[model samples]
Structure formats: C-alpha cells, structure tokens
Target: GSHMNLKVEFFNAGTQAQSNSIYPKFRLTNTGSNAINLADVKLHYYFTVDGDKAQTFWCDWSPVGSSNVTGTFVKMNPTTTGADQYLEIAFSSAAGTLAANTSIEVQGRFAKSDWTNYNQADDYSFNSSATTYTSWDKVTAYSAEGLIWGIEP
Candidate 1:
C-alpha cells in the first residue's frame, strides 16, 4: 500500500485444469487512496511459449454454471488476443465498482486445446488495473497474486 500511490493487490487464488479446459480464478483488491472504477476487469494469462494466436488454437469461452462470472460476456468482446500472447478476460461494464482499500472475487475460466501445443503455465497478471506496479519486486506483499489458489474439486 505504501509502495506507490496506486497499490493494487491481485491474488491469483486458484486454477483448475482438465483435458480440454482450465478454470482461472483470481481475487482483486485496491488497497490505494483512490477508488477503482470497476468498469471492465481483465485477467491476463501469459504463456512462456506457444502463446502465439496462430500457433495454438484454443477453444472458445464456456461458462461454469457454478462459477462466479455473473456478468454477461457479450461473449464476442469478452476476450481478446494481441502482442504475441496471453488470454485476456474482459468483464462487462456491469461488473461493478471497487472502492478504495477493498477487495473483490473475480472468477472465470478459459478453454484449452488438447490436440495442440499447450504448455499451460501457472500464474497470471492483472494489468491495466485501477492500480499496478511497474516492476515485480515492488509488489511482493501480494506475491501470492500468482498463488495456486484453492477451490472445490
């Protein structure tokens, strides 16, 4: 919180994987002085290799009825690919707002390709947030932001 003007704590609590699908879940927080206008929340999943859009053709988005994704995906604009990598989960405007010094639980999943080249790494990044650190070391408090979170199997 004292690290910078904007101290955002992104907790990568859990990830569930199967043969053809993976559920990525995270907890977001704005422990800063300013309010985080919770417009569209995005979860960034970067791969070390084969992150290329064409290299690995991942499946489309599917909802887990028991999950926390209550907002509409609009489906088309919910996800995007660029800059040679990563899976971006863009929430709808209806996602809601996050006030100062508070937290949120944002859960969602991504489809993977069983027949394609998939490394499937651990950890994720919540960029373009209400607040973020320029470097990795600065945000050590939330080090577990990439923590292998827990959920019912």
Candidate 2:
C-alpha cells in the first residue's frame, strides 16, 4: 500500500499518429493536508523520438503563469520500448505553493524543432481516450520525498 497524496491527471490534446506536435496537458492536485512547494515537484512525460531533430517545449496556458512552467528533455539510457526520452516538467519558485485539495492545470505541448510529425501511437504516456482530464499513472510525478505518484516507463 502507498500513502501518496499527490495526484497527476492527464489528457491528450493531439492525435496518436501523424501529428505535428505532441499535445499533453497535465493537472496536478494536492490531496494532503499541507501545501506543497511547486519548486520541489517534477513531472515526466515519456515518449520515443523517431528522428534526430531537436525538440522544444511550449506551455500554452497555466494559471500558475506560463513563465513559471519549465520543461527539459532527457534521453533515456537503455531505452525502453515506448519511451526513449522524457520531457521533464518543472515549476519555478515563483509559482508558489499548492495548497491541500487545490489543483493546477498545465496545458503543454512539444514538437520537433522543424515542426515535423511524430508517431505518438507507441508512446508510453499516450492515451487514446484521454481527451478529457482523468487520473493517469503513465505520467510520473515526484517530490522532495520521492516518487509520490504515477509510474515511470
């Protein structure tokens, strides 16, 4: 059994295949009794890079402020089947705290630098029916204590 009190919900904003960009929106909710520092949390979205093109991240919207959201790409060593890399989403200290029972929505997307297409069909975190907010364990979340929610690919 686990005592995780933080939750990560996800939804797809793009198609599973032949998409110019991978549109993955995330919502983080804190269910515990205390506030959590945004700076201490990190979320990961895993996928495979089909080509050698560089990638870039975009925060379409966030109540926390787009500037407060940050993303970084990390290549997976001993790459897994559906995930050879992951987009690490983080927040700056200015984003402030996540109070108990409060949630934050982060509408994010990423794409190849040249705006090329991607085959998200085989992505570890890709969900075909997740067009609306729902609890998703494929996208992992961590905090100062460690992995507080979701599963890593």
Candidate 3:
C-alpha cells in the first residue's frame, strides 16, 4: 500500500445549502499504482440547522462529468469524531475505480436537501470531514435515490 495515495477536497460546484458554504462535494485523488475497485468511501459532514437538523438528510445533488462518483441519501455510519454528524458514499462496482496518480472530481453531490427554506447563508452549521485514503483501501461510491420546509416561504 506504499504506492497508495488518495486525497479528497471540497468541490465548490457540488457544495450544498449550508452555512459558510461548508457543505461538501468532495473530489477524490489517487496516487497509487493501481485503480481502486469496489471501494467504500465514507464521508463526515456537520450540518448547521435551525432548531431542526433532520432536514439535512434530504439532498439535491448533481454530479460532474466523465467522473464515476455516485452519492445518495442512504449514508452509512457517521459520528462527531472531530466535527458533527457525517454520511457515507460508496463505489458500487469496479467500473468506478480510480486510476493511479489521478485526481477525480466528484461527478455528483447534493446541492439541495429536505430542509425547507433552504437558501444562501442559512443557520446551517456545516463542515467537511477532511479524510484520506490508501491503496487497496475500501472506498466505493453508491447509488440511490431531498428538501426543506414549512413556513417563512
């Protein structure tokens, strides 16, 4: 795994409806000598809310082009390991493997969510997880299937 090197950064375009533009659409990087296949990529995102955080689960994400990243509302385990609650994204098949030493922009991510009254500079407490990966590690993009709500519309 010495040849492995993966880096992910926040994509401005895929950024979501969160405060300080903190919602992340992480772009991935691969510096290993192999293309990672069937990898499970997990991400952590802390959401800023307005008396209700449940709305964060719903999303309105659009992916980039020629990239094989796929995300969904079906996130796995997350925690406040450093920030707030976070979510997961996985690569379902080997077809989404990352080539060695190449940085791949996230093809898609949530721009909107179930939270109502969503807009710029809301009371959202969002932050990125800031993670890393190694060669032969488990990191994959998954598929699946967002919003905001009532009053003050």
Candidate 4:
C-alpha cells in the first residue's frame, strides 16, 4: 500500500441542478500512519463551465481557518466528458500540519464573474446525493508523493 493514505469527503452545498454558484464542502483526512503538512496537499474539484466566463473562488470557512485555504481555477487543455475545468484547492504554509487519522474541513464556493448560473448536472465533481459529507472519489487529492486519494477526471 502507499505510505500516504488520504481521503476526501465531499458534499454539495448548492442546488443539485442549476445554481448561481457552486458550493463544494470538503473534508480531507489523513488516514495514514504519519502526519502530513497541509501545504503539501492539493485537491482538484472538476466541473464544466456552462459558458466561457471568468470565475471567482471563495473559502467561506474551514477548521483550518478560511484564509489558510486557497483556490485557483484551471482550464483543461483537453477537456473531458464532465470536466472542462477544475478548481485547485491549496493550503498556505501557515495552514499547518494534518495529524495522522485526523481531518480538516474546507467550505468553498465558486461563481461566474457576472454571477451567472452553472448547470452542475454534467459536472464531474457535482453529486446531487451528496448533501451530507460522504466519501467522494470524484474529488481528487494529491500530496508531494502524488495522488493520495480520489480519481482525476
């Protein structure tokens, strides 16, 4: 098995279908035996933008502190079925470490620059049933050693 065992739990805090913004709450857990630094991890939440519009990201809250979480939107060079772009969630060095078997929560949201709507029905990371925290493999996670959890779109 891999030395680092991390997991991602996700929930959709927005409308299941169309919404003005995409709210994706995440619970990142370090299930391995060794603790890991938060700055060493990154998460990718994939989706397809309804229109070619610039987007904005927000970290509403988190146990690790909202300011500690960062988000960056990336457009895929070769888009996939349910993923044209992704929001890469990162942590600042000040975010600190994630002890083994412990978890960190990050509440994040993204919206179109003009406050437009997004049809999440075809978004790779959008889960209608995930209204509560559930193990979601669609939201990929990575560490210095590479993919530690979930599947990339």
- For each candidate, what is the lDDT? 0.36, 0.87, 0.37, 0.88
Could you tell me every candidate's TM-score relative to the true structure? 0.44, 0.94, 0.48, 0.94
For model 2, residues 1-153, the per-residue Cα lDDT tens digits are 233577889999886687889988998888888888888888899998888488988888988899899888999888998999999998999999888889999998999899888888999999978678899989998887778878886
How should the candidates be ordered by lDDT, best one leading? Answer: 4, 2, 3, 1
- Model 1 ranges with Cα > 4 A deviation: 1-19, 48-84, 113-117, 121-153
Tens digit of per-residue lDDT, candidate 4, span 1-153 = 645677788998986587889999999888888878889889899999999698888999988889999899999879998999999999999899888889988998999889888999999999987668999889998888888888887
- By TM-score, rank the candidates, best first: 4, 2, 3, 1
In model 3, the worst 10-residue window by lDDT is: 144-153
Q: For model 3, how big is the CA root-mean-square deviation? A: 10.5
Query: Best lDDT goes to which candidate?
Result: 4
**Candidate 3 deviant stretches above 4 angstroms:** 14-23, 51-84, 107-114, 117-153
Give the clashing pairs for model 1.
12-145, 13-149
Q: Candidate 2 overall Cα lDDT vs. reference?
A: 0.87
- Which parts of model 2 are misplaced by more than 4 Å? 1-4
lDDT of 1 by residue, 35-153 (tens): 64443343444432233223222222323222223322112233333112444444444545557677654445443334433333322332332232133221122121232111101
